[PDB]
Design a protein around this nucleic acid. Structure first.
Length: 252
DNA sequence: GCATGCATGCGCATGCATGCATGCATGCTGCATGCATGCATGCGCATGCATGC
């Protein structure tokens, strides 16, 4: 088992192979593939003398219209990563994201029930259709992004809970399509505090080129004809999990 | 006229209908617990209208 890990560490094209092993079913879009890997790996958490906490999670937003293949990236991550959750904008309530309190039949105590953000602690939370979120939900997401805590005050229960999680979010342009003549802020529907703390914004735009269309169509038809014998990725999922686990234990 | 035995009251001893308090235990009952139930509340979200531009 260590034989394969030490073989991986040596190869001096390992970065390109790792990039080419992510979301193999999707065609192209290498920038998003790099971003997702960097988000699965992580940064460093630091603390100053004055108790100021320096954050070390990377947050990504993918912007495209309903035509673009932006949900396949999210479905790949929710199938690969160890602790990940998939939620959608209008099928989710605030209590289902932060937490809820229920009482025991045994009597004498209460119990907390975890939400999407708590079930993704030290992990990636996937949100599809970020633009259909309410301001009430966005104030909780902002609290999870600046602080790593969730505050509960309902029915006389006070509790501070840990949400150390990264955000993967997909957003639709405000008017269906992306206006190249406006700025990024003009095309999105987010609160200023939320937009500021996102690290990378990836915009997927369509181009009309014949050779790319031929390649894409060939790929799509190949998958239907040949089932799963149409990928031949450099690495497998079980191989990739082990490398990610090993990589997260280094402190540069 | 004298001697005798019976019936009449004294002079002991014992039992007996009334009557009332006390300590123990019975028997109920008012109190504290637990719980089902259904109406109201305090709340965040989605729609339709009014006011500009």
């Amino acid at each position: 088992e260590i034989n394969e890990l030490k073989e991986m560490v040596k190869d001096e094209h390992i970065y390109d192979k790792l990039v080419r092993s992510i979301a193999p079913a999707v065609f192209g879009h290498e920038a998003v593939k790099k971003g997702i890997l960097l988000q699965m790996l992580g940064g460093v958490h630091k603390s100053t003398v004055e108790g100021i906490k320096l954050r070390g999670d990377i947050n990504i937003c993918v912007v495209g219209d309903p035509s673009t293949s932006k949900s396949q990236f999210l479905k790949y991550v929710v199938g690969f990563a160890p602790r990940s959750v998939y939620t959608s904008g209008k099928a989710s309530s605030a209590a289902g994201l932060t937490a809820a309190v229920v009482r025991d039949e045994e009597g004498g105590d209460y119990t907390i029930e975890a939400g999407a953000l708590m079930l993704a602690d030290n992990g990636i939370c996937c949100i599809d259709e970020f633009d259909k979120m309410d301001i009430s939900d966005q104030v909780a997401i902002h609290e999870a992004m600046e602080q790593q805590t969730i505050s509960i005050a309902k029915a006389g229960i006070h509790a501070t809970l840990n949400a150390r999680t990264s955000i993967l979010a997909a957003a639709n342009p405000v008017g269906g399509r992306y206006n190249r003549k406006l700025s990024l802020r003009g095309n999105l529907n987010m609160t200023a505090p939320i937009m500021s703390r996102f690290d990378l914004f990836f915009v997927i735009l369509d181009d009309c080129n014949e050779k790319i269309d031929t390649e894409l169509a060939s790929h799509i038809v190949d998958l239907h004809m040949k089932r799963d014998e149409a990928i031949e990725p450099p690495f497998s999922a079980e191989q990739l999990r082990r490398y990610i686990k090993y990589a997260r234990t280094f402190k540069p």
